[PDB]
Amino acid sequence: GSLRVLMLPWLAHGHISPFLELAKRLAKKNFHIYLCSTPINLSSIKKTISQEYSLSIQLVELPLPSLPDLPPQYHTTNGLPPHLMPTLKRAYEMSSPTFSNILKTLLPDLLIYDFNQMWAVDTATSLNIPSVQFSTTGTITASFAMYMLKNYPFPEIYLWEYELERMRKAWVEEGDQLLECASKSCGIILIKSFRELEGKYIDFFSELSGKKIVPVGPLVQEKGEIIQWLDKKDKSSVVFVSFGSEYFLTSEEMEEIAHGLESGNVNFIWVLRFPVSVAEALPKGFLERIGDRGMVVEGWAPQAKILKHSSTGGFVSHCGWSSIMESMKLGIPIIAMPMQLDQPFNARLLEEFGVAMEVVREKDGTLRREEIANVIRKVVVEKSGEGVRAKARQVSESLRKKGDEEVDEVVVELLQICRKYELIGKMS
Template structure:
């Protein structure tokens, strides 16, 4: 007799950053839409209120759960996500996040989900979920090559004796260790940090104001999870996914690239899109460079100036989505910049619908900070990439893309990461116009066959959910 399929209840708890929240919500929507399972999506009140509207076909299956963020010194009243605070205040946001331990525990006790799909930050969560017999999956928005570079946990889950020394991130104590591929990568790779990026990496390894380091959080989550779900696919990085599975000794499951659905843009902001599209409609096909460095990047005044002057010097039409920083500090455009580029370029300081802009046929290239979600969006439309990474895994993603000739990085000084208007201008012209840059434009178009194939990507979600279903059936029988 055929086994009756049971509806699962899945709780989702992303880190308090929209680069984590949105992919997590996208995964939740796909699980609900394709498999009919119930989702409890957990975040803070203001973050929940800022989410895109849940489509009517899945709204009955998704419950948005608001857990108030505890008050913490150094955090302003409305700061509930990383985009709301300057970079140096993020450790205090982690303190507030850790304060969600008790209300989250109560929610899990009373709602009794089958699974919790969580992020890297709640190092305290696995023991709580285990005590309540709730299965655990860590959902990583970081791609497999970046996770491989960072390395497996300090205490391998079931590694054979003697392997700890080889794979212990703690053994990489000098800057020189991070500018070469790690010993555990068995194939040729150029995915490394530059010296100026490696200096910043030590912030992740050392304990911050929250009392623990980001590496401690990640290690504890690795050690306490049953599956690692990762926002990537075999067609993009099979060798890295296979390697990471060997390093972690737990199932590493690609859930696809989670491309956002175009019909799910912010409806209430359509007048914004009308204004932007009106300008884009006047530009030649494939001529416009879209410039957006994400909601959390705060370039120095010097970097900001060189980027602006490089854009001007390139003579490329551009649309620059320039958001005011959370700390309130404003950066000034070079004097006369907007007058000199009038008609050829637009500096847009409000909210900009990135997915729709990238989808417009006049856009040919994208100056990006190399956030994995932004890369995913750009490749759905075959947009050539000009790479300008700043923090975290962005440098590793830039090397990953360059290795595949899927983007070109703006040249910078190895020691301090500075760049010039000339390097910006030359890279823009190479990727957008020059004959020798055709390879990058072709490669970007080629990427649409993977990144733009919705059915291929959705099959990954289906396989992941089948694993969740099968695992719970085994537990329930046991």
């Protein structure tokens, strides 16, 4: 059994990357994938696609209508000015006629879409093509959203008091669209997760949504200076520090993290991202005292290569979903520093699962250097962290032995959906 699938991620690198990783697993099961996004997004992940997928993954351009304030270079959330987000969402909706013509041209057996393309589902439906939603975050995130929109039985999933305000402002500021998108998913919703981590939240999400929730697994994807420096350090002795691709540290946050890294006296690699100089942003004399014991990287760093390296011993993470799946696959315990959005809940999940220890902030929500240093030391160095180091090792082994069992379940489910949908279509 094989299917020709058109996949439509939301316009963020953080969404197309999981869609691309799912496409690769389906390709290795003899599906043909059309991965459809704006040209500015396709040009980027284009380079990261091995020629092994030359036959099975085809990129399909969906240009948006452009305006002076939103030229094609801004047809993505990556580096987008925040005031332009409603204009980008509107432009995406208005590409619907272009999308219908892609569907008429390719006539795939199936559309896999993301969290808000109501117009895309409707278009496929009018051409008698079924549509299945793929959630690129976990079931804890999805079932919380339903609990918020369709009105919580898990006491380990809670919010610190200083996290309530950011959560309240986010939910008090379209929910109907998000519910409708999920409701129009044909039979199942696919989700980037696995039962050993999220089983009971998966089941809860299934009961709330009225859909079978099908986990697709973790979907994890010449020596540079970073790797050359890592080669010189002891085993499991370096902490990697990165806060994702869409969050910027405040000035206060950046200072305390720098003091915490120096107080912790654990070798580090810290990627620093600034909105559109290094020695100017760090406390006086910081780089001089650190010497060879750490390095600060502006902008971007090879995250998977670093986490894979035998010298790496910990990951200071905002707990974005891709980053925590990668860390779990590669056996690196997490120093959890959730920043925004779904991250507090991911942090609660990873502490409960046993692979993370959280840096808890003060009542006022601010960071302390001594809390950062204490948690880095106990995860990477001290006896207090052996359980977290051991569970990370254990999880990595199991995921490496799991391979692609979840993908076989995904294929079988999608074949059944598409067969039934086609038999009903022959009746017209």
